[PDB]
Amino acid sequence: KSLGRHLVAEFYECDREVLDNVQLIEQEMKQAAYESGATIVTSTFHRFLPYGVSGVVVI
Amino acid sequence: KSLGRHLVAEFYECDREVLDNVQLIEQEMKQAAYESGATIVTSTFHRFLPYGVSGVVVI
Amino acid sequence: XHLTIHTWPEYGYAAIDLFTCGEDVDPWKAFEHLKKALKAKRVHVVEHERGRYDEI
Amino acid sequence: XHLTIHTWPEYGYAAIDLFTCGEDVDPWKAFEHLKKALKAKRVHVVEHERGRYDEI
C-alpha cells in the first residue's frame, strides 16, 4: 500500500522518572524496535537539560 | 500553543541523483537546520545499498 | 526507518514517532512496548501512510 | 526536536519530517531549503501540533 507506516503518538501522564532517564529510554526504545521486528542501524540518545530526553533509533 | 511544530512531508519527483548522495543530503539537512535556527545536537546519516539514504539531525 | 522520542518530564508528556517500512515490520508492536514502558495513561495516535504506491 | 529524511531514489521520493520546538524555530524554513535543494516538483505536507498546552 505504501513504502512505510508511520505512527505519530502523543503520550500523556507517563512515569516521570522514566521520562527523565536517558539510559532507560534508550533501552526501552531499542527493545521497542526489536518487538516491531525491525533491524536497528544506529541509535543516539541525549539528555536535555534540565529535565528531558531526546533520542532516535534508525532502522 | 504546543511544545512543538511537526511537518510530515511527502516529497515527489525529486532529483534522483541528490536523493542518492549521502554527503549532499547531510549537507542540505544541516543547512535546513541552520535556516530554521535550530541548534544541532547531533547528526547521523547512512547510505543503504543499492539505493537510499537515511539521515537524522537531532535538534 | 526510525523511532524517535522527545520527553518533557515536567509535564509527564512524550512525543513519539514510529515510522517503519516492510510488511514484516509492525509499528504497533513498538507502540505497545513503549506504552507499557512509559506507564502512559492517555494516548493519541495518528497513522500516516508514507509513500503511497498510487502517489509515487 | 528533530529533522529526518529517508529517500527512495528509484522513486524520486523522500519522506521528510521537520519536528521543531520553540517560537524562534520555524520548521517551514527547513522545508523551503529542502524543497529547493532536492528539486521536488510535488509535495504534500501535514503540520502537527506536538504537545498542545490544553492537552498537557
XYZ file of N, CA and C in Angstrom, unseen atoms left out:
688
model
N 0.858 -1.223 0.000
C 0.000 0.000 0.000
C 0.884 1.260 0.000
N 1.916 1.246 0.834
C 2.829 2.379 0.932
C 4.210 1.858 1.282
N 5.235 2.678 1.065
C 6.604 2.268 1.386
C 6.777 2.111 2.893
N 5.928 2.776 3.667
C 6.041 2.649 5.106
C 4.804 3.048 5.880
N 4.797 2.689 7.160
C 3.707 3.003 8.072
C 4.306 3.943 9.108
N 3.567 4.986 9.469
C 4.100 5.969 10.412
C 3.147 6.362 11.528
N 3.509 6.024 12.758
C 2.684 6.383 13.901
C 3.217 7.634 14.603
N 2.342 8.624 14.717
C 2.651 9.878 15.385
C 1.833 9.816 16.671
N 2.510 9.627 17.794
C 1.796 9.498 19.050
C 2.127 10.510 20.136
N 1.082 10.898 20.864
C 1.200 11.809 21.992
C 0.977 10.883 23.194
N 1.924 10.874 24.129
C 1.800 10.068 25.338
C 1.643 11.061 26.479
N 0.570 10.917 27.251
C 0.314 11.813 28.376
C 0.355 11.029 29.687
N 0.577 11.743 30.788
C 0.628 11.149 32.121
C 1.534 9.924 32.206
N 2.794 10.087 31.821
C 3.746 8.989 31.858
C 4.519 9.010 33.177
N 5.243 7.928 33.450
C 6.073 7.842 34.649
C 7.166 8.882 34.431
N 7.180 9.925 35.248
C 8.166 10.978 35.062
C 9.608 10.594 35.343
N 9.797 9.565 36.163
C 11.127 9.047 36.446
C 11.626 8.296 35.221
N 10.687 7.718 34.479
C 11.002 7.029 33.235
C 11.315 8.048 32.146
N 10.497 9.092 32.057
C 10.702 10.117 31.040
C 12.041 10.839 31.163
N 12.551 10.955 32.387
C 13.819 11.637 32.598
C 14.977 10.679 32.867
N 15.008 9.565 32.144
C 16.085 8.603 32.309
C 16.634 8.255 30.944
N 17.666 8.982 30.541
C 18.273 8.787 29.242
C 18.643 7.340 28.940
N 19.277 6.663 29.892
C 19.688 5.287 29.662
C 18.504 4.341 29.530
N 17.521 4.470 30.414
C 16.357 3.597 30.341
C 15.596 3.807 29.024
N 15.277 5.061 28.709
C 14.566 5.361 27.472
C 15.245 4.687 26.283
N 16.571 4.775 26.199
C 17.256 4.141 25.075
C 17.012 2.641 25.075
N 17.056 2.081 26.246
C 16.827 0.681 26.395
C 15.490 0.280 25.859
N 14.528 0.952 26.410
C 13.145 0.731 26.018
C 12.949 0.981 24.531
N 13.460 2.103 24.035
C 13.320 2.413 22.620
C 13.952 1.318 21.778
N 15.124 0.848 22.186
C 15.776 -0.217 21.434
C 14.914 -1.482 21.435
N 14.376 -1.838 22.596
C 13.546 -3.033 22.699
C 12.295 -2.884 21.836
N 11.703 -1.693 21.845
C 10.506 -1.444 21.039
C 10.819 -1.758 19.579
N 12.010 -1.367 19.139
C 12.414 -1.630 17.766
C 12.429 -3.136 17.533
N 12.974 -3.870 18.496
C 13.055 -5.322 18.401
C 11.671 -5.961 18.256
N 10.717 -5.493 19.057
C 9.357 -6.030 19.023
C 8.686 -5.851 17.666
N 8.894 -4.698 17.036
C 8.303 -4.449 15.725
C 8.930 -5.366 14.674
N 10.048 -6.003 15.021
C 10.703 -6.905 14.089
C 11.628 -6.203 13.117
N 12.014 -4.981 13.455
C 12.897 -4.192 12.611
C 14.346 -4.387 13.029
N 15.258 -4.053 12.123
C 16.692 -4.164 12.375
C 17.229 -2.765 12.693
N 17.924 -2.628 13.820
C 18.492 -1.345 14.231
C 19.809 -1.036 13.524
N 19.874 0.131 12.886
C 21.079 0.555 12.187
C 21.943 1.335 13.185
N 21.318 2.243 13.921
C 22.050 3.034 14.887
C 21.080 3.681 15.860
N 21.601 4.157 16.982
C 20.774 4.820 17.983
C 21.599 5.868 18.705
N 20.991 7.017 18.933
C 21.680 8.089 19.610
C 20.681 8.783 20.506
N 20.938 8.719 21.803
C 20.059 9.341 22.769
C 20.753 10.449 23.534
N 20.007 11.506 23.811
C 20.570 12.639 24.506
C 19.688 13.105 25.642
N 20.337 13.548 26.710
C 19.647 14.010 27.897
C 19.629 15.524 27.926
N 18.499 16.109 27.545
C 18.382 17.557 27.557
C 18.464 18.067 28.979
N 18.737 19.357 29.108
C 18.859 19.996 30.408
C 17.881 21.166 30.518
N 17.151 21.261 31.643
C 17.195 20.350 32.790
C 16.569 18.995 32.497
N 15.281 18.878 32.794
C 14.546 17.644 32.583
C 14.234 17.463 31.107
N 14.359 16.230 30.627
C 14.074 15.954 29.231
C 14.991 14.935 28.586
N 14.433 14.147 27.677
C 15.200 13.141 26.966
C 14.809 13.183 25.496
N 15.792 13.040 24.619
C 15.558 13.036 23.178
C 16.416 11.934 22.618
N 15.843 11.118 21.741
C 16.606 10.031 21.164
C 15.982 9.498 19.897
N 16.820 8.930 19.044
C 16.352 8.375 17.791
C 16.982 7.028 17.525
N 16.203 6.148 16.922
C 16.691 4.835 16.571
C 16.434 4.630 15.084
N 17.510 4.629 14.296
C 17.388 4.423 12.861
C 17.258 2.925 12.631
N 16.301 2.540 11.799
C 16.079 1.133 11.476
C 16.099 0.985 9.964
N 0.974 27.422 21.041
C 0.040 26.669 21.924
C 0.311 25.162 21.930
N 1.563 24.808 21.651
C 2.009 23.420 21.646
C 3.521 23.453 21.809
N 4.066 22.472 22.516
C 5.504 22.407 22.739
C 6.282 22.400 21.423
N 5.731 21.753 20.402
C 6.432 21.699 19.133
C 5.572 21.746 17.887
N 6.242 21.957 16.759
C 5.596 22.006 15.456
C 6.246 20.971 14.549
N 5.430 20.068 14.019
C 5.926 18.952 13.235
C 5.307 18.861 11.837
N 6.164 18.894 10.821
C 5.710 18.794 9.450
C 6.004 17.386 8.949
N 4.974 16.704 8.473
C 5.142 15.360 7.932
C 5.053 15.633 6.443
N 6.146 15.401 5.727
C 6.183 15.732 4.310
C 6.542 14.657 3.301
N 5.756 14.637 2.235
C 5.965 13.729 1.125
C 6.570 14.560 -0.019
N 7.823 14.276 -0.385
C 8.497 14.962 -1.497
C 8.489 14.020 -2.691
N 7.948 14.494 -3.809
C 7.837 13.681 -5.017
C 8.624 14.247 -6.184
N 8.981 13.360 -7.103
C 9.714 13.728 -8.302
C 10.945 14.580 -8.018
N 11.716 14.158 -7.027
C 12.935 14.856 -6.651
C 14.043 14.523 -7.647
N 15.169 15.215 -7.525
C 16.321 14.956 -8.374
C 16.880 13.661 -7.794
N 16.802 12.585 -8.565
C 17.250 11.275 -8.103
C 18.722 11.139 -7.753
N 19.573 11.967 -8.336
C 20.987 11.882 -8.006
C 21.182 12.406 -6.583
N 20.573 13.554 -6.296
C 20.679 14.150 -4.969
C 20.188 13.182 -3.888
N 19.044 12.554 -4.143
C 18.449 11.619 -3.199
C 19.380 10.466 -2.856
N 20.307 10.150 -3.751
C 21.216 9.042 -3.501
C 22.628 9.491 -3.134
N 22.764 10.764 -2.777
C 24.056 11.328 -2.401
C 24.050 11.601 -0.892
N 24.632 10.690 -0.118
C 24.640 10.812 1.331
C 25.330 12.059 1.884
N 26.427 12.497 1.272
C 27.129 13.685 1.766
C 26.364 14.977 1.455
N 25.641 14.993 0.335
C 24.863 16.171 -0.042
C 23.608 16.251 0.818
N 22.970 15.115 1.061
C 21.771 15.121 1.892
C 22.127 15.672 3.262
N 23.237 15.197 3.801
C 23.679 15.654 5.100
C 23.972 17.141 5.001
N 24.613 17.544 3.909
C 24.939 18.951 3.718
C 23.665 19.774 3.745
N 22.674 19.334 2.984
C 21.407 20.039 2.894
C 20.572 19.985 4.173
N 20.516 18.825 4.821
C 19.752 18.723 6.057
C 20.369 19.661 7.089
N 21.697 19.681 7.182
C 22.334 20.563 8.149
C 22.048 22.034 7.831
N 21.937 22.364 6.546
C 21.654 23.743 6.163
C 20.226 24.096 6.578
N 19.297 23.190 6.294
C 17.900 23.397 6.645
C 17.806 23.671 8.138
N 18.640 22.992 8.913
C 18.630 23.188 10.348
C 19.033 24.626 10.617
N 20.078 25.089 9.935
C 20.538 26.461 10.113
C 19.424 27.448 9.774
N 18.796 27.256 8.617
C 17.722 28.140 8.169
C 16.552 28.231 9.143
N 16.348 27.188 9.822
C 15.376 27.203 10.806
C 15.759 27.810 12.142
N 17.055 27.953 12.414
C 17.522 28.473 13.690
C 17.910 27.397 14.695
N 17.443 26.177 14.453
C 17.683 25.086 15.279
C 19.160 24.860 15.637
N 19.352 24.533 16.915
C 20.641 24.220 17.500
C 20.841 22.718 17.427
N 21.780 22.336 16.580
C 22.057 20.961 16.226
C 22.669 20.259 17.435
N 22.065 19.140 17.814
C 22.544 18.352 18.935
C 23.476 17.289 18.384
N 23.005 16.594 17.353
C 23.777 15.542 16.720
C 23.213 15.234 15.345
N 24.048 14.670 14.484
C 23.627 14.341 13.132
C 24.195 12.998 12.690
N 23.365 12.156 12.081
C 23.835 10.850 11.622
C 23.149 10.436 10.320
N 23.952 10.087 9.321
C 23.436 9.719 8.008
C 23.986 8.411 7.469
N 23.131 7.660 6.778
C 23.503 6.357 6.238
C 23.183 6.127 4.768
N 24.093 5.418 4.111
C 23.986 5.071 2.703
C 23.627 3.592 2.608
N 22.390 3.312 2.218
C 21.924 1.940 2.081
C 22.128 1.492 0.640
N 22.355 0.200 0.442
C 22.562 -0.319 -0.901
C 21.410 -1.199 -1.374
N 21.131 -1.182 -2.685
C 21.841 -0.394 -3.698
C 21.484 1.095 -3.740
N 20.297 1.448 -3.250
C 19.852 2.841 -3.255
C 19.216 3.244 -1.931
N 19.197 4.547 -1.669
C 18.577 5.044 -0.456
C 19.503 5.691 0.548
N 18.989 6.696 1.242
C 19.756 7.398 2.254
C 18.850 7.743 3.424
N 19.279 7.373 4.622
C 18.515 7.688 5.817
C 19.371 8.617 6.644
N 18.765 9.698 7.109
C 19.511 10.651 7.901
C 18.646 11.408 8.874
N 19.233 11.730 10.014
C 18.517 12.452 11.040
C 19.404 13.452 11.747
N 18.836 14.619 12.004
C 19.525 15.669 12.723
C 18.683 15.905 13.969
N 19.260 15.627 15.130
C 18.556 15.841 16.382
C 18.757 17.301 16.756
N 17.649 18.006 16.947
C 17.696 19.412 17.282
C 17.014 19.707 18.614
C 13.193 3.775 9.170
C 13.576 4.583 10.267
N 12.671 4.917 11.225
C 13.147 5.390 12.520
C 12.074 5.414 13.607
N 12.542 5.423 14.845
C 11.697 5.502 16.024
C 12.323 6.657 16.798
N 11.516 7.641 17.159
C 12.022 8.792 17.885
C 11.179 9.060 19.117
N 11.743 9.832 20.036
C 11.060 10.164 21.264
C 11.656 11.427 21.857
N 10.779 12.297 22.327
C 11.189 13.543 22.956
C 10.278 13.679 24.169
N 10.881 13.741 25.352
C 10.096 13.814 26.575
C 10.226 15.108 27.351
N 9.139 15.435 27.805
C 9.015 16.551 28.736
C 8.641 16.063 30.134
N 9.570 15.637 31.067
C 9.341 15.111 32.415
C 8.417 15.971 33.255
N 8.627 17.282 33.186
C 7.838 18.245 33.948
C 6.337 18.173 33.661
N 5.980 17.681 32.478
C 4.577 17.571 32.080
C 4.102 16.128 31.929
N 5.006 15.175 32.145
C 4.659 13.773 32.012
C 4.222 13.493 30.588
N 4.835 14.204 29.644
C 4.497 14.082 28.229
C 5.647 13.615 27.342
N 5.316 12.787 26.358
C 6.314 12.297 25.431
C 5.769 12.276 24.009
N 6.526 12.870 23.094
C 6.145 12.883 21.690
C 6.922 11.736 21.062
N 6.202 10.772 20.492
C 6.818 9.594 19.889
C 6.454 9.362 18.418
N 7.442 8.938 17.633
C 7.230 8.637 16.224
C 7.763 7.254 15.891
N 6.899 6.450 15.292
C 7.238 5.086 14.939
C 6.972 4.937 13.455
N 8.026 5.169 12.674
C 7.979 5.113 11.215
C 8.796 3.919 10.763
N 8.096 2.924 10.226
C 8.721 1.694 9.757
C 8.410 1.393 8.291
N 9.129 0.427 7.731
C 8.931 0.006 6.347
C 8.908 -1.523 6.296
N 8.384 -2.081 5.211
C 8.330 -3.527 5.101
C 7.119 -4.108 5.807
N 6.514 -5.113 5.186
C 5.329 -5.760 5.732
C 5.642 -6.544 6.998
N 6.905 -6.919 7.151
C 7.351 -7.690 8.299
C 7.669 -6.818 9.508
N 7.378 -5.527 9.389
C 7.643 -4.574 10.459
C 6.358 -3.880 10.893
N 5.883 -4.222 12.084
C 4.647 -3.657 12.612
C 4.941 -2.555 13.616
N 4.576 -1.324 13.272
C 4.833 -0.202 14.169
C 4.050 -0.263 15.475
N 2.914 -0.945 15.465
C 2.092 -1.064 16.664
C 2.694 -1.953 17.743
N 3.683 -2.753 17.359
C 4.385 -3.611 18.301
C 5.374 -2.760 19.082
N 5.839 -1.692 18.444
C 6.737 -0.738 19.090
C 5.915 0.122 20.054
N 4.758 0.574 19.585
C 3.857 1.400 20.387
C 3.489 0.698 21.694
N 3.034 -0.542 21.572
C 2.627 -1.312 22.742
C 3.708 -1.425 23.803
N 4.937 -1.689 23.372
C 6.067 -1.808 24.295
C 6.265 -0.479 25.023
N 6.319 0.589 24.245
C 6.508 1.902 24.810
C 5.390 2.292 25.754
N 4.146 1.996 25.391
C 3.033 2.344 26.268
C 3.272 1.713 27.638
N 3.635 0.434 27.650
C 3.910 -0.273 28.898
C 5.080 0.377 29.628
N 6.181 0.566 28.901
C 7.413 1.155 29.434
C 7.274 2.525 30.096
N 6.490 3.422 29.555
C 6.216 4.791 29.977
C 5.082 4.840 30.995
N 4.223 3.836 31.129
C 3.082 3.918 32.025
C 2.080 4.959 31.536
N 2.166 5.284 30.250
C 1.287 6.266 29.632
C -0.168 5.975 29.964
N -0.883 7.013 30.380
C -2.264 6.887 30.736
C -3.354 7.364 29.810
N -2.911 7.985 28.801
C -3.766 8.564 27.776
C -2.900 8.755 26.550
N -3.324 8.179 25.430
C -2.563 8.317 24.206
C -3.441 8.724 23.052
N -2.794 9.271 22.037
C -3.461 9.707 20.830
C -2.480 9.362 19.740
N -2.925 8.555 18.786
C -2.064 8.141 17.692
C -2.713 8.336 16.340
N -1.958 8.910 15.410
C -2.431 9.098 14.049
C -1.512 8.272 13.163
N -2.087 7.368 12.381
C -1.274 6.559 11.496
C -1.204 7.186 10.099
N 0.022 7.430 9.647
C 0.277 8.009 8.326
C 0.839 6.956 7.392
N 0.431 7.018 6.138
C 0.960 6.118 5.139
C 2.032 6.942 4.457
N 3.279 6.486 4.524
C 4.364 7.221 3.891
C 4.689 6.597 2.543
N 4.628 7.431 1.514
C 4.901 6.990 0.167
C 3.907 5.985 -0.380
N 2.656 6.408 -0.553
C 1.630 5.537 -1.120
C 2.085 5.142 -2.521
N 1.753 3.924 -2.937
C 2.135 3.461 -4.265
C 1.418 4.280 -5.331
N 0.153 4.597 -5.089
C -0.628 5.376 -6.033
C -0.250 6.858 -6.029
N 0.871 7.192 -5.395
C 1.336 8.576 -5.337
C 2.711 8.693 -5.980
N 3.511 7.641 -5.864
C 4.850 7.647 -6.441
C 4.875 7.023 -7.836
C 13.124 18.357 18.206
C 13.661 17.327 17.397
N 13.320 17.213 16.107
C 14.217 16.528 15.182
C 13.874 16.745 13.709
N 14.862 16.534 12.862
C 14.708 16.633 11.415
C 15.206 15.371 10.719
N 14.339 14.723 9.968
C 14.671 13.446 9.322
C 14.356 13.358 7.834
N 15.092 12.490 7.152
C 14.890 12.248 5.738
C 15.208 10.796 5.415
N 14.353 10.193 4.604
C 14.525 8.819 4.167
C 14.204 8.861 2.677
N 15.209 8.610 1.839
C 14.999 8.669 0.403
C 14.864 7.334 -0.329
N 14.156 7.400 -1.451
C 13.898 6.274 -2.340
C 14.193 6.788 -3.754
N 15.485 6.872 -4.109
C 15.957 7.345 -5.416
C 15.210 6.708 -6.575
N 14.992 5.404 -6.468
C 14.295 4.657 -7.500
C 12.885 5.197 -7.743
N 12.357 5.973 -6.799
C 11.022 6.550 -6.951
C 11.046 8.084 -6.964
N 12.230 8.668 -6.805
C 12.331 10.119 -6.772
C 11.565 10.645 -5.573
N 11.370 9.762 -4.592
C 10.626 10.080 -3.371
C 11.464 10.245 -2.100
N 11.036 11.166 -1.242
C 11.727 11.403 0.030
C 10.708 11.657 1.122
N 10.837 10.930 2.227
C 9.944 11.107 3.369
C 10.685 12.040 4.326
N 10.173 13.251 4.474
C 10.782 14.263 5.328
C 9.936 14.626 6.546
N 10.615 14.824 7.672
C 9.964 15.194 8.923
C 10.719 16.358 9.550
N 10.003 17.441 9.794
C 10.608 18.620 10.393
C 9.840 18.913 11.686
N 10.373 18.376 12.782
C 9.741 18.475 14.094
C 10.601 19.456 14.887
N 10.044 20.637 15.132
C 10.760 21.699 15.826
C 10.122 21.964 17.194
N 10.826 22.749 18.005
C 10.328 23.170 19.311
C 10.793 24.588 19.654
N 9.842 25.465 19.964
C 10.144 26.839 20.311
C 9.656 27.830 19.277
N 9.212 28.992 19.747
C 8.705 30.033 18.863
C 9.741 30.680 17.945
N 11.021 30.509 18.249
C 12.062 31.097 17.416
C 12.607 30.128 16.373
N 12.068 28.912 16.367
C 12.478 27.878 15.415
C 11.321 27.612 14.436
N 11.537 27.907 13.157
C 10.497 27.732 12.141
C 10.781 26.547 11.218
N 10.014 25.458 11.351
C 10.226 24.279 10.500
C 9.988 24.552 9.023
N 9.231 25.599 8.724
C 8.952 25.921 7.343
C 10.161 26.432 6.578
N 11.133 27.004 7.278
C 12.357 27.464 6.617
C 13.132 26.214 6.203
N 13.088 25.192 7.061
C 13.759 23.935 6.767
C 13.108 23.339 5.530
N 11.780 23.406 5.464
C 11.045 22.875 4.314
C 11.415 23.589 3.019
N 11.502 24.909 3.078
C 11.821 25.685 1.892
C 13.207 25.351 1.364
N 14.199 25.258 2.246
C 15.540 24.920 1.783
C 15.606 23.512 1.198
N 14.892 22.562 1.792
C 14.927 21.193 1.278
C 14.161 21.024 -0.047
N 12.983 21.635 -0.163
C 12.217 21.537 -1.413
C 13.088 21.995 -2.590
N 13.869 23.046 -2.354
C 14.766 23.612 -3.353
C 15.936 22.685 -3.633
N 16.701 22.392 -2.585
C 17.874 21.519 -2.669
C 17.583 20.179 -3.334
N 16.415 19.613 -3.041
C 16.033 18.330 -3.610
C 15.261 18.445 -4.915
N 14.881 19.665 -5.274
C 14.146 19.892 -6.507
C 12.848 19.104 -6.635
N 12.101 18.983 -5.542
C 10.820 18.271 -5.590
C 9.859 19.054 -6.481
N 9.104 18.358 -7.324
C 8.153 19.039 -8.205
C 6.749 18.960 -7.624
N 6.603 18.148 -6.586
C 5.310 17.972 -5.955
C 5.499 17.589 -4.496
N 4.763 18.258 -3.616
C 4.856 17.964 -2.193
C 3.508 17.980 -1.497
N 3.442 17.233 -0.407
C 2.244 17.152 0.405
C 2.744 17.256 1.832
N 2.235 18.221 2.585
C 2.682 18.381 3.966
C 1.581 18.472 5.010
N 1.774 17.737 6.099
C 0.849 17.742 7.216
C 1.582 18.425 8.376
N 0.907 19.356 9.042
C 1.511 20.040 10.172
C 0.847 19.616 11.485
N 1.631 18.999 12.354
C 1.113 18.564 13.640
C 1.533 19.469 14.786
N 0.614 19.674 15.720
C 0.917 20.457 16.907
C 1.303 19.393 17.941
N 2.584 19.304 18.281
C 3.004 18.310 19.256
C 3.010 18.921 20.661
N 2.378 18.224 21.600
C 2.323 18.713 22.965
C 1.508 19.982 23.113
N 0.236 19.916 22.734
C -0.657 21.061 22.858
C -0.854 21.401 24.328
N -0.750 22.683 24.663
C -0.856 23.103 26.056
C -2.115 22.605 26.759
N -3.254 22.647 26.073
C -4.501 22.191 26.676
C -4.534 20.675 26.805
N -3.780 19.986 25.956
C -3.726 18.536 26.033
C -2.924 18.173 27.266
N -1.771 18.816 27.422
C -0.921 18.568 28.574
C -1.346 19.484 29.722
